[PDB]
Design a protein around this ligand. Structure first.
Ligand code: ATP
Ligand code: ATP
Ligand code: ADP
Lengths: 534, 107
């Protein structure tokens, strides 16, 4: 026995996680804490390894170092997954073998009283003959896994080893590395919560409080509630950025204003720095991105007709439905409308007003030149990442352009079709909601391919069809004069009006490119030219 | 004793609850070996991988004295789509050959 029965995990680095320690100890290392005498009387072996999986950058290695330290073991021998890889035949195996030289020597010499060695892999998935299943060529010369297995156990027995692995894609691990007698204990490290964020922020700001250099104005609870779905490293980055900005401001002010030395020595970080850097410096991967909205909602939304209100209200009802309910952890909805009816903007809007923590937009714009397998990889990655939050809402910007449709033929990529059809019907991990929004301009084709059946609801987005609607929209935009408006109203009473908002904006901009004399006539001529009759 | 291999097919209109009935009838058998092979676990695979997975499941199932193997949503496995038509031939042939193979004597 080298530790107290109740352990201790506080103000020694790791602060977020406290229950996982107790759980893992109760499950795994009960053998090494009990009076030895009965242990030798027991004839029972010790667990020969464990595996940890969780979202990247959530503080896993710290657990390994702490557990290695507390047990009174030797120095951990860190190693990197991809690093152990060579193109020369029969070379990586030597690397895998060398790691156990010290343990072998100690076991041979001291017999059954040697110390404890610990070996810490990193991205253990690097060496597996399972990644080759997916579309590609990464057979990684399976021999590696056989060598690793035959070294952990086999004809020669080692009783002085403990293997700890860290990975991010739990699925891609070969099954054989989980049978009893080998790595045989799993655990999950989920995202931190409010209390964990508070503890981590408090820990990393101890120096400033000790030296009083921090401004008294700043709190920690406010900032903690501000950060919704950050990760471990993000809090440290935020603190560093705040320090840098505060000091830059202080030095610039001192140079600009010859302040008395009293404030010059003072380097108070103040509170403005924290918020400024938070909104301008750090961009969490798992959090909301306020930036992307502007890239699609470029001109806001102006209420020009009743349908907008109906659509927004229905979106609100769907959001309410997905938030609080059971028996339906997954929901779907599809938007359809003629070309240039501004479907995308509505989707982005409704997603924004959803007010969910995790929101992401995946459009074909960031995938040009990709072969289909890459598209499957992207879809899978984004959905898998979205599965790691309590709530989530994803937006598939343009379903049609994803499939590579073209009326001639017809032609498309079947593989993407399957991937989407299967994915739209997979419940998240237990106790987690979701919301998926589509978009398209070709309803009939989707109806024909049986995919419309998978979606669970539909909404319609019509166009401008009435003259008075056009007058009201023009007035809202505010680009035409009173007598000019009268002329337009006089000439547009025919009611044969059917146009899309995007086209209307472009047409107005074009018509505003000559002298005031001829604007009305040119605009009317161009509008008359586009006499659509759906 | 003289019919070691049996088969059965469920079918109905969509949303009629077939998967649930299949799973329930499988559970109520009290056989020692059960295994469900669904399309949800092979997203984005290549057909060769699907064939290998099918072969592995059936090989493992052979070893025991009893068993009950369930294949769910045949059409999705084949990757059917009414336009065309288009689908995978390899999966179809593998499944069809498998579905009439006897295990080793007395199983
Ligand atoms: N109330 C509104 N309704 C629709 N669009 C609006 C509205 N107000 C402004 N817009 C502008 O309409 C455009 C909408 O872009 P969007 O991509 O949705 O159009 P689209 O051509 O119909 O779609 P897509 O090409 O993606 O199929 C943006 O410029 C947006 O600024
Ligand atoms: N008698 C019943 N038959 C079928 N499902 C039932 C029955 N009673 C309740 N259910 C519920 O129905 C749901 C089963 O629906 P399920 O998704 O299996 O339908 P399906 O038509 O077989 O699916 P799919 O065609 O999408 O593969 C479960 O919630 C189950 O609890
Ligand atoms: N629970 C935690 N408490 C304190 N710091 C943490 C915690 N989790 C992550 N960190 C921060 O993350 C950094 C190390 O991250 P690391 O352990 O390498 O992530 P991973 O284990 O996922 O690779 C440290 O600088 C540390 O400040």
């Amino acid at each position: 026995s080298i530790i107290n029965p109740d352990w201790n995990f506080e103000k020694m680095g790791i602060g977020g996680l406290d229950k996982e320690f107790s759980d893992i100890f109760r499950r795994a290392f009960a053998s090494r804490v009990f009076p030895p005498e009965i242990v030798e009387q027991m004839g029972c072996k010790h667990v020969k390894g464990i595996l940890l999986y969780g979202p990247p950058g959530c503080g896993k290695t710290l657990l390994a170092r702490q557990i290695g330290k507390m047990l009174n073991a030797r120095e951990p021998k860190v190693v990197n997954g991809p690093e152990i890889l060579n193109k020369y035949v029969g070379e990586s195996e030597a690397n895998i073998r060398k790691l156990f030289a010290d343990a072998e020597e100690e076991q041979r010499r001291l017999g059954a009283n040697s110390g404890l060695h610990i070996i810490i892999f990193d991205e253990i998935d690097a060496i597996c003959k399972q990644r080759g299943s997916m579309a590609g060529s990464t057979g990684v010369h399976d021999t590696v896994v056989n060598q690793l297995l035959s070294k952990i156990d086999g004809v020669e027995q080692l009783n002085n080893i403990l293997v700890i692995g860290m990975t991010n894609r739990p699925d891609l691990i070969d099954e054989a590395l989980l049978r009893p007698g080998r790595l045989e204990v799993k655990m999950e490290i989920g995202l931190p919560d409010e209390k964990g964020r508070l503890q981590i922020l408090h820990i990393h700001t101890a120096r400033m409080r000790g030296h009083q250099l921090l401004s008294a104005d700043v709190d920690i609870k406010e900032l903690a509630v501000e950060t919704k779905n950050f990760s471990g490293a993000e809090l440290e980055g935020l603190v560093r950025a705040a320090q840098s900005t505060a000091m830059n401001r202080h030095i610039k002010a001192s140079t600009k204003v010859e302040v008395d030395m009293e404030k010059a020595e003072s380097l108070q970080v103040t509170r403005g720095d924290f918020l400024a850097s938070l909104e301008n410096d750090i961009k969490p991967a798992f959090g909301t991105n306020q930036e992307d909205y502007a890239s699609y909602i470029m001109n806001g939304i102006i209420k020009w007709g009743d349908p907008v209100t109906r659509v927004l209200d229905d979106g609100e009802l769907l959001v309410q439905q997905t938030k609080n309910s059971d028996r339906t952890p997954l929901v779907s909805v599809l938007l359809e409308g003629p070309p240039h009816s501004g479907k995308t903007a509505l989707a982005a809007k409704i997603a924004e007003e959803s007010n969910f923590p995790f929101i992401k937009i995946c459009s074909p714009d960031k995938m040009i030149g990709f072969s289909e397998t890459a598209k499957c990889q992207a879809m899978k990655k984004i959905f898998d990442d979205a599965y790691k939050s309590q709530l989530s809402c994803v937006v598939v910007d343009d379903i049609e352009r994803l499939l590579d449709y073209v009326p001639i033929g017809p032609r498309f990529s079947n593989l993407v079709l399957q991937a989407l059809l299967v994915l739209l019907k997979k419940a998240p991990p237990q106790g987690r909601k979701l919301l998926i929004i589509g978009t398209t301009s070709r309803k009939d084709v989707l109806q024909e391919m049986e995919m419309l059946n998978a979606f669970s609801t539909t909404i319609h987005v019509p166009n401008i069809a009435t003259g008075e609607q056009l007058l009201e929209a023009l007035e809202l935009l505010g680009n035409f004069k009173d007598k000019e408006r009268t002329t337009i109203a006089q000439q547009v009473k025919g009611k044969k009006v059917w146009i899309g908002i995007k086209k209307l904006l472009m047409l107005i901009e074009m018509s505003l490119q000559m002298d005031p004399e001829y604007r009305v006539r040119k605009f009317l001529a161009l509008l008359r030219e586009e006499g659509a009759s759906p």
